[PDB]
Amino acid sequence: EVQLVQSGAEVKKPGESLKISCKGSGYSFTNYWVGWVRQMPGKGLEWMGFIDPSDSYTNYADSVKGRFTISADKSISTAYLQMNCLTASDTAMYYCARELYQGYMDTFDSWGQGTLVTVSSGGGGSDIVLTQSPATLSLSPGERATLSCRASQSVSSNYLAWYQQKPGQAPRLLIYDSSSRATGVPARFSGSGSGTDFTLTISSLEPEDFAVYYCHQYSDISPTFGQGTKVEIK
Amino acid sequence: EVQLVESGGGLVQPGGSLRLSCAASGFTFRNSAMHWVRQAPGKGLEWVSSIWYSGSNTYYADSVKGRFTISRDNSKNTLYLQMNCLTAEDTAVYYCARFAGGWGAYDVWGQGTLVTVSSGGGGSDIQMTQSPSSLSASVGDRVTITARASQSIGLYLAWYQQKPGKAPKLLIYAASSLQSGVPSRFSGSGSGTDFTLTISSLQPEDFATYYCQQGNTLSYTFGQGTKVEIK
Amino acid sequence: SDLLGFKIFGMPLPLYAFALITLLLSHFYNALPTDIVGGFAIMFIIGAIFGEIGKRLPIFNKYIGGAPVMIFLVAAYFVYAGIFTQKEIDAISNVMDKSNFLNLFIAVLITGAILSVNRRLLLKSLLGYIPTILMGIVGASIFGIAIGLVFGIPVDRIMMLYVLPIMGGGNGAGAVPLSEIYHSVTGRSREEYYSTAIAILTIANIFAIVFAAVLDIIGKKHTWLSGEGELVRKASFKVEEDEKTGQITHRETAVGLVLSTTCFLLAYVVAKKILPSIGGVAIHYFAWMVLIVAALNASGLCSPEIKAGAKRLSDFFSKQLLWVLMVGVGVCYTDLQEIINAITFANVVIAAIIVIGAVLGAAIGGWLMGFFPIESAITAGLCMANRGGSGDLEVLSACNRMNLISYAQISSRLGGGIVLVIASIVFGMMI
Amino acid sequence: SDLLGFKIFGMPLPLYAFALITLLLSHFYNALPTDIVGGFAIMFIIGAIFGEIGKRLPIFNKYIGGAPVMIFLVAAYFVYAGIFTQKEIDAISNVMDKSNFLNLFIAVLITGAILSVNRRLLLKSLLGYIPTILMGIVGASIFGIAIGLVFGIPVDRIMMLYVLPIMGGGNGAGAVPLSEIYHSVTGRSREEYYSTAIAILTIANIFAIVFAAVLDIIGKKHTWLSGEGELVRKASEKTGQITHRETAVGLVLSTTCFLLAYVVAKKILPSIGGVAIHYFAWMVLIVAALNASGLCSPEIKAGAKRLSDFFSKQLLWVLMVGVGVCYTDLQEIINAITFANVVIAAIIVIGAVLGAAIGGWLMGFFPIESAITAGLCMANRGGSGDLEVLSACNRMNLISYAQISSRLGGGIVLVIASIVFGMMI
Amino acid sequence: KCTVSHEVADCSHLKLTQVPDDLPTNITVLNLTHNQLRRLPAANFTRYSQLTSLDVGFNTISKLEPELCQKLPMLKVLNLQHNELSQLSDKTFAFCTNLTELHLMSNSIQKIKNNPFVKQKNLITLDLSHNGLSSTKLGTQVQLENLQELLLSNNKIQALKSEELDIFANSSLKKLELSSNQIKEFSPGCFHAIGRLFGLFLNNVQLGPSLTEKLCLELANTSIRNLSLSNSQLSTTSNTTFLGLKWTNLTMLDLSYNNLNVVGNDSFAWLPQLEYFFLEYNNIQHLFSHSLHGLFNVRYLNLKRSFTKQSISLASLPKIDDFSFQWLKCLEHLNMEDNDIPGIKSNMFTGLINLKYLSLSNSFTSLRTLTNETFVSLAHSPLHILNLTKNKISKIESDAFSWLGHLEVLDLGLNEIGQELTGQEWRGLENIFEIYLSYNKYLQLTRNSFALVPSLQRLMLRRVALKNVDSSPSPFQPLRNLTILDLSNNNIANINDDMLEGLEKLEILDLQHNNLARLWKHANPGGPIYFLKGLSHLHILNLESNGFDEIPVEVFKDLFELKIIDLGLNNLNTLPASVFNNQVSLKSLNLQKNLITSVEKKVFGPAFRNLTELDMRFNPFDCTCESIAWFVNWINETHTNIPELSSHYLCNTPPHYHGFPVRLF
Ligand SMILES: *[C@@H]1O[C@H](CO)[C@@H](O[C@@H]2O[C@H](CO)[C@@H](O)[C@H](O)[C@H]2NC(C)=O)[C@H](O)[C@H]1NC(C)=O
Ligand SMILES: *[C@@H]1O[C@H](CO)[C@@H](O)[C@H](O)[C@H]1NC(C)=O
Ligand SMILES: *[C@@H]1O[C@H](CO)[C@@H](O)[C@H](O)[C@H]1NC(C)=O
């Protein structure tokens, strides 16, 4: 005859608040503890904690503490579970269960219906993707490099740039437009290409030219770097 | 010369907030668009957010949308980035840069600061491993499942049955081998480390997945799944 | 019909309508090249519209300053209220900090100003006239500091922001270079200096005109203290001026650019490498420019035609391209709050004391060296504390004296650089 | 004269030595500001001496352009051997490319040239101009295939590697788009093509300069050929005093029109069709329309002309230094030189010259004045090539037609290439 | 196949048919179990012939050599179990008179000889079982005077005859047993004829009330002291059952597993003195008030599982009238485990005086709450130990233990208790030492909780779910002589500093499986919580499995006497330097399954001075010379015991040394 009823399922994007209510009737509700169990999709069960409605004493598992709270109100015969930072990978089925508890020889659990919470990341994409090509190029002092970069769509008005980053340092600008040069750069670097294909050549390598180079585009409101290719000596 | 120096925090818990600041000295900080750029260890660069002068327009990368706030204060030549409810996988070095439009993309860079997210380990966790991961049989067959515990738990064990769609909602043994009133033809036994569940003869309804928990510590620990009796 | 025929920047109204619709279209579609060609268009249009309003106003034009002051106020207000798109702010700052148009402008003005003075006048002036100017500056400085101690203002503030900007050449050449030197030597912000100097300069301009008439009345009441519009006494002049050719082809104007840039290069090299610090102090390269150009005039290498060549070029920059420069000055320098915060009774009375101190110093210095005192004040302390060459036709017209225009020109043009050198020295010495 | 009365750029020698000393000091101490004010001095001072030398050589004054050519070659040679320091190159680049002084120069010349023409004769002379360049293209192609057959090179390779890049607009337009079309259609490698084209076109540009220099004396020998002025055979209000203000208004117009053209060609009407319009083609039409509107007084029209002359006669030698330093890499010319390339690239241009001259004579234009404008301004390298070519033959009044022949011809050439890549293979 | 020599000879499971002959002579003990022998090689044994012990097990021998006994006269004990011989002559035992013990198990000896045992007199114990016989005859005349123990289990004797037992008249059997031997009739006077029989053991023999009463008559005026009888189907008794037994002096009895049903009044009135009495595994439904009248001298009574199982359908309700115990005036030990008594009446234990120990584990089917007078009947006896586990008690009222004055041990664990300790529930206690409360539901602690029991010495609270434990005045404060405290498994969250203050006699503490990781973390507001100070006597400390990851150095400042400390199952990685300095005498350590990577001598400086045992079995070691060198060198050069050193100690951090035994550098 004992019953447990929970609120209906729902879906929220990464957000800061959610409340699930567990309502039960058919017994005193002031003499039995209430516990919470979570089951991830196609996985085993997990325990979080329990509360005593009589005087609101609460005990938690170590993991869930600091991001969840449990409270209940006698007058309505209800218990509440609250999430303070909803996030990804927290999508799972949630249960509330009454527990007929003593030391030994009893019925340790008697469950309820269950609620579903889904945390959708939200639509994204719509971003020009950049792909480097000669990853981990290996050369000897005295020869050319000829890196490459290729884009998903047509970058408008030739908005592209190349940097280098020696280890443990901030990057440095080399070719701010598709063809121009920064002030300090020497006269061997040069880039070209337009549309969806681009290049970058080094005429004659030097001992101080060994680092990782990137590929940066800034046409729209959504900048997007590429991965880096590495230039080291055999 | 032109210099941008930034300073902030590190080693935050998986839930919390933080604030970063950077100062500019060598140029006209006002009248310049500014950007935040981060780099995870051993990874490529990634954009974060940007702001005009006067804070007129603000845009965020999709990944950090809704949890980050950017603002500036001209009179002190200072730029802030506000992070709320930080989570994991945001550990990276963070840079502040100046965007100069057509005449140079990213001319001036900072040094960078490091932020890491905490990740502790579980405490009281007596581990329990079920034995047969899956079992398929026919009507009128006798089956046997096994449960093994890390340390000795004396006579404090129980089994549950979960239908494919509904809640488990069915304990079957109060203590080791004591039925909960309703079901029949079930049996169990064992003591100390190992325990055993056996069914005399299957029935059409007894096709689900089972479970086992322990009760020797107030931090209860359920079993890692259990044999899925099928067919 | 004022609707058709009224001229804006030398253009009929319908033409300017076409010139403005282009700017509006560019603002709407957000398309703008960021370089010289993109910058000049949107500076020319805005300056042209907002200078005419300023000039054609009853009380503003004659007293406050008129066309230039309005432009750099309106542009600063546009920046403050956030009207400009980001691309326009970039396109305006680019031609002012990366292409470095400001240095070219300042160099051309300095060269054109100093290279035009006649050689004989310059040589003769080193004996009798320059010392009066120096004594005037000295006399004004002590009055300024004395009145400053009354109001509780420290010395390094009075000597650096109050007495130097007054005795310059206005904001065109004499208030921007001062700010550049102040930012270079000391190293703090430059918005503050320009913002708080422009107000005091414009305030003192008024008291100059006011005191002109008072000096005239005093010269009427008493007799020996005055001359009859004659600077020197007991002297005779027999010099016959040489004649320029009278035709100035474009070639001479082009020659004007070559000299202007070259002197800048030489000054930059010498200041950075050869003589970084003659004493404990270090000299900014603008002072070296002034000295080098003066020496070039003294040597006499330049022909009489080329001298007049650089004067025509300096009048093309200072009459037409000024309204372009003021927009950039407003965007990159002005801080609107400082101007408001700097208007008070104390700032008025201090500026009114400094001018009288200058007049007294110049008058007492003139009498030691021949000239009549009362006409050695108008041309040494009043004609010098002005908005440069704009107010010289005003001060002299306030009195009934026009024969001293040559001396007024010498004062403004040549003292425009003396104060620059003194400023470098003082900025180095004090801090 | 006298050894002290000789004038260099209108300056006496004792004064010029003063600037030479400054230049040498700046070079040796290695101190230089990297912006406009430190870039004009270098270019002025070098150009003055090397343009005064180039007008006094015995054989180099008549057959080849005296001042404008020698400076152009000498600057490139200097950058080749590394005589220039890093900072001097970095400042010349700042003056010439980043701040785009070249665009300002071109805009000023165009504005000064169009406004001064009578409104009635604009389109009548233009309607016949277009078929001339089409005739020139065929004239070039015939000689190209003939010389390729003589050398035995297959015709497809000739039309894909030699003729089209030579006839193209230039590096900015006519080098990259050809690479894109070729790679997209034939699916072969892209980077290799852009390497050979960028050398073939410069090799053709040099010969274009020299041939354009020869035509002047050729026309001098036979008077009935050259018109020395307007290229139309059939053609063969007063202004008050002009003060400074009408000179500055002419500079305001030249930078408003360019902005309008840029806005139109970037956002409003990008392409009529397969033709993509460069933002100088619009400017000519916009200024022509402005002239037809009659909005401008007769004094403004005369004022713009004087500014045009000032830019065209004093600040010319300044430009050549930058053009040589930035837009000419002698390294690739040396590395990619060979006998066959020189022969074929010297035959193609003369073929184009003959074709364009004949086509011009069919429709009554002056032959010499029509071969310079169409066929030579077509073969060279874009705007810079146009400036060098027109300066060598001392005809700067025709800058209006050169931009037409360059930009519109480039668009037509891209269309032709799009057809022919598929058609021949 | 060699035999080890340790002054004894072991030959087991060698399945060899012939005795080894290479055994050293001077040994005196041989073991020949799990082996097969055919005949006696007197020669091989004569080589030694000094053995005083000799056992052959699971060996089948058809016959025995008479000559080996003179060959080996030094033998004292012999075991013959599962031996095939079933008819032996005295001829073999002609020279075997020097034995003292002889075992003859599983021999199926159908019949005995005439005088096979007349020759020997020096043996003491002779057991014969698993044999088929029907008579007690073993010798023609009286002999074997020096035997005390005789065993005749698993045989088929039918009726006792006096003429059968006449041989042992000169001797007196200490204890005879005839279990598993179905017997029906007794000849009169048989027990008197044989002689004094102190101990008689009969088990698993069907007698019944009628035949047993006959047996009681036969035993009158006999020298018996220990009568054991079990599995005899003794359902019920009358007074006449033991009437004839009143003419002797017994001291012990046994009625286990007889399935007794009902006892009449005064049934045991014939036994004045009976020191011990077992009564278990029988089914009694009702006890009469005078059924236990007559038992004056009783010291030890057992009633484990000696009542009817409750059945609601049966409504059996095993019931005891009060005042039924008022006759046991000398009882010191009572037991009532595993019964179904409904409850405690008001006069159940009226009369007991010398009671000292009472166990009531799992005794009552329903005892929900304890009242003011629930133990009033026990006012007048010095009860020392009480046992109340497994009784599903639910709540205790105040003033419940006022009657028990001298009590000093109380066990309440393993029950169903949830309430708030007002402190008045310990009112009457005066000398209690230990209290067990583990395995219950929950308790609520207050300041005025244990103030009434300042003499306590032990307190077990294991898995109890304490509430309100962090009050400002420590609820443990009034106790001062406490030595042992346990708080394991409670999953406690927070603790105040002063919870242990004013305690100096604490010897053992235990806090495993609680959640205390947060407090010691430095980032905690208020700094680390130091709950360990002033403890100048600690010997054993346990903190296993709490989730620790950081240890402030100032925790073990006062631990001058630590001997054993455990920190396993935690998440320790890098403990700070110079933390164990004050530990003068440490003899053990435990850090298994932590996250330690590298070992340095600065932290383990004084720790490794002299250890008896160490355990660091599982860790992700970085076996590279920078730090592991000290450990590898120290291990080779030290004698501290490290079990499973070779196998479990492994490293994986150096990719090349991934899964490599760190033992070999
Ligand atoms: C046997 O023991 C019973 C145990 O109750 C005793 O019973 C009492 O004795 C009186 C004697 O007259 C009986 O009438 C009643 O059955 C009992 N009385 C009370 C007040 O309970 C008695 O010792 C024996 N039984 C009988 C029937 O005498
Ligand atoms: C006890 O009973 C035994 C029975 O044999 C008897 O010998 C003995 O004398 C009795 N003792 C007393 C003190 O009556
Ligand atoms: C004890 O047994 C006798 C018979 O020996 C009987 O007469 C008497 O009533 C019994 N006493 C009881 C049952 O109290």
d(CA D257, CA D253): 6
Q: Which residues line ligand 2 (CB under 6 A)?
A: E 221-223, 248-249
Beta-carbon contacts of residue D425 (< 8 Å; ≥ 6 apart): D156, D186
Phi, psi for B222 (deg, rounded to 5): -80, 170
Nearest by CB: C107 against D25, D37, D94: D37
Residue recorded with tokens 């389109």: D123
Q: Are B213 and B158 in contact (CB under 8 A)?
A: yes
Tokens representing B47 are 């954009």
Q: d(Cα D278, Cα C109) in Å, to the nearest integer? A: 39
Going by their DSSP bridges, the two strands A57-60 and A45-52 should be labelled as: antiparallel
What are the helix and strand counts (H, E) for chain A? Answer: 0, 21
Pairing of strands A3-6, D7-8: unpaired
**Are E547 and B123 spatial neighbours (Cβ–Cβ below 8 Å)?**
yes
B86 within 8 A of B38, measured Cβ to Cβ = no
Closest ligand to E290 CA?
A: 1
Contact E467/A at CB under 8 A: yes
Do A13 and B218 count as a contact with CB atoms less than 8 A apart?
no
Residue B204: which of B139, B143, B135 has the closest Cα?
Answer: B139
**Residue E243: C-alpha distances to residues D236, D367, E185 (Å):** 171, 164, 19
How many residues in total does chain A contain? Answer: 234
CB C366 within 8 A of CB C380: yes
Which residues partner with A57 through β-bridges? A52
Q: Which helix (H) or strand (E) holds B112?
A: none
Point out which residues pair with B228 in neighbouring strands. B134, B209
Beta carbons of A62 and E517 less than 8 Å apart? yes
| End-to-end CA gap in chain E | 40
User: Distance (Å, rounded) from C-alpha C175 to C-alpha C179?
Assistant: 6
CA distance A149 to A130: 7
CA distance E108 to E89: 15
Residue of E288, E325, E327, E345 to mutate, ligand 1, most atoms within 8 A of C-beta: E288
Q: How far is CA E455 from CA D395, E349, E499, in A?
A: 123, 28, 19
Most B CBs within 10 A among E438, E513, E592, E593, hence the mutation to make, goes to E513
Q: Testing the interface with A: which of B48, B52, B56, B169 to mutate, by most A Cβ within 10 A? A: B169
Residue E632: what are its φ and ψ, rounded to 5°?
A: -60, -45
Cβ atoms of residues A134 and A126 within 8 Å: no
Report the alpha-carbon distance of residue E345 to residue D297 in Å, rounded: 131
Domains of chain A and any CATH numbers: 3-118 (2.60.40.10), 130-233 (2.60.40.10)
Q: Where are the beta strands (DSSP E) in E556-629?
A: 564-566
What whole-number distance in Å separates Cα of residue C211 and Cα of residue C219?
Answer: 12
Alpha-carbon distance of E538 to C271, in angstroms, equals: 80
Fold annotation for E507-665 = 3.80.10
A19, A82 in Cβ contact below 8 A? yes
Residue spans of alpha helices (H) in C62-175 = 67-81, 86-93, 101-115, 119-128, 130-151, 155-161, 163-166
Q: Report how far residue D213's alpha carbon sits from residue D68's, in angstroms, rounded to the nearest whole number.
A: 11
**Residue length of chain B:** 231
* Tokens 């009882």 found at: E331
Q: Is the CB of E101 under 6 A from ligand 3?
A: no
Helix (H, G, I), strand (E, B) or coil at C10: coil
Look up residue A128 and give its two tokens: 């020009």
End-to-end CA distance of chain B, in Å?
77
Q: First-to-last CA distance in chain D?
A: 68
Sequence-ordered list of residues with C-beta below 8 angstroms from that of C371, at least 6 positions apart, any chain: C128, C132, C231, C232, C233
Q: Can you state the percent helix, strand and coil of chain D, rounding each to 5?
A: 70, 0, 25
Chain centroid offset of residue D183 CA: 29
Domain boundaries, chain E: 507-665
Structure tokens at D329: 């890499």
Write the residues followed by a gap in chain B (C–N more than 2.5 A). Answer: none
Give the separation between CA C150 and CA C155, rounded to whole angstroms: 11
Half-sphere exposure of D91 (CA within 13 A, CB side): 20
Distances (CA, A) of E410 to E406, E426, E430: 11, 11, 12
Q: CA distances (Å), E407 to each of C286, E30, E362, E397, E480, in order?
A: 107, 55, 21, 18, 19
Helix segments in E57-117, DSSP class H? 68-71
Residues E143-148: contacts with CB under 8 Å, at least 24 apart: E143/E115, E143/E117, E143/E118, E143/E167, E144/E117, E144/E120, E144/E168, E144/E171, E145/E121, E145/E170, E145/E171, E146/E121, E146/E122, E146/E171, E147/E123, E147/E171, E147/E173, E148/E124, E148/E173, E148/E174, E148/E175
Which of E643, E665, E641, E639 is CA-nearest to residue E654?
E665
The residue with tokens 């030094």 is E74
- Using alpha carbons, list the distances in angstroms from residue E76 to D237, E8, E73, E99, E406: 161, 15, 9, 4, 54
Q: Between chain C and chain A, are at least 3 CB pairs below 8 A? A: no
Give DSSP secondary structure letters for E218-287: HTTT----EEEEESS---EE-GGGGSGGGGS---B-B-TTS---EE-TTTTTT-SB-SEEE--S----EE
Best of A148, A178, A188, A192 to disrupt the D interface (most D CBs within 10 Å) is: A192
Nearest CA to A114 among A88, A89, A81? A81
Closest C-alpha to B212, from A45, C421, E363 = A45
CB-based contact D127:D369 (threshold 8 Å): no
Residue among D187, D160, D196, D191 nearest D417 (CA): D160
Of how many residues is chain E composed? 665
User: Could you tell me which residues are beta bridge partners of residue A232?
Assistant: A138
Ligand 2 midpoint to CA E276 (Å): 18
Compare CB distances from B52 to C79, C86, C332 and report the shortest one's residue: C86
Q: Which of A180, A183, A194 sits opposite D180 (nearest CB)?
A: A194
Give the amino acid at D78: F
Both structure tokens of C318 = 């200072």
CA atoms within 13 A on the CB side of C274: 13
d(CA B15, CA A25): 36
Residue E274's CB is within 10 A of a number of other CB atoms, namely 19
Sign of CA dihedral C191, C193, C196, C201: negative
Q: Is C198 helix (H, G, I), strand (E, B) or coil?
A: helix
E266 lines ligand 3 (CB under 6 A): yes
Name, in order, each residue with C-beta under 8 angstroms of D224's C-beta and a sequence gap of 6 or more: none
Alpha helices (runs of H) in A52-153, residue ranges in sequence order: none
Which H, E and C letters describe E307-373, residue by residue? CCCCCCCCCCCCEECCCCCCCCCCCCCEECCCCCECCCCCCCCCCCCCCCEEECCCCECCCCEECCC
Q: Kindly list the partner chains of chain C, i.e. chains with 3 or more CB atom pairs below 8 Å.
A: B, D
- Ligand 3, atom 1: nearest CA belongs to which residue? E239
Decide the pairing of beta strands A3-6 and A18-25.
Answer: antiparallel
Is residue E13 exposed (0-12), middle (13-18) or buried (19+ Cβ within 10 Å)? Answer: exposed
Are D40 and C257 in contact, with CB atoms under 8 Å apart? Answer: yes
Residues of C in contact with D300 (CB under 8 A): 11
Q: Which two tokens stand for residue E69?
A: 């006994």
* Torsion angle in degrees (nearest 10) through CA of C386, C387, C392, C393: -130
Compute the nearest-CA separation of B119 from chain E (Å).
11
How far is the CA of C129 from the CAs of C371, C414, D16, D160, E355, in angstroms? 9, 11, 33, 78, 135
> Where do the structural domains in chain D lie, given as residue ranges?
7-99, 119-229+308-424
Q: Which domains does chain B have, with CATH numbers?
A: 4-115 (2.60.40.10), 128-230 (2.60.40.10)
Q: Are E653 and E659 in contact (CB under 8 A)?
A: no
Q: How far is A74 from chain E (nearest CA, A)?
A: 20
Whether the Cβ atoms of residue C8 and residue C48 lie closer than 8 Å to each other: yes
Please give the number of the atom of ligand 1 that sits closest to the Cα of E265.
1
**E167, E190 in Cβ contact below 8 A?**
no
Integer Rg of chain E from CA: 35
3-state secondary structure of A128: coil
Using CB atoms within 10 A of its CB, is residue D250 exposed (0-12), middle (13-18) or buried (19+)? buried
Given a contact cutoff of 8 angstroms between Cβ atoms, the answer to whether E397 and E422 are in contact is no
Give me the resolution in angstroms, 1 decimal.
3.3
Q: Measured between alpha carbons, how far is D258 from D242 in angstroms, rounded to an integer?
A: 25
CA–CA distance, C71 with A98 (Å, rounded to integer): 78
When CB atoms are compared, the residue of C90, C97, C332 closest to B101 is C90
- The continuous run of DSSP H or E covering A147 comes out as strand A147-151
Q: Token match 């320059």: residue?
A: C130
Q: What angle do CA B221, B223, B228 make, to 5 degrees?
A: 160
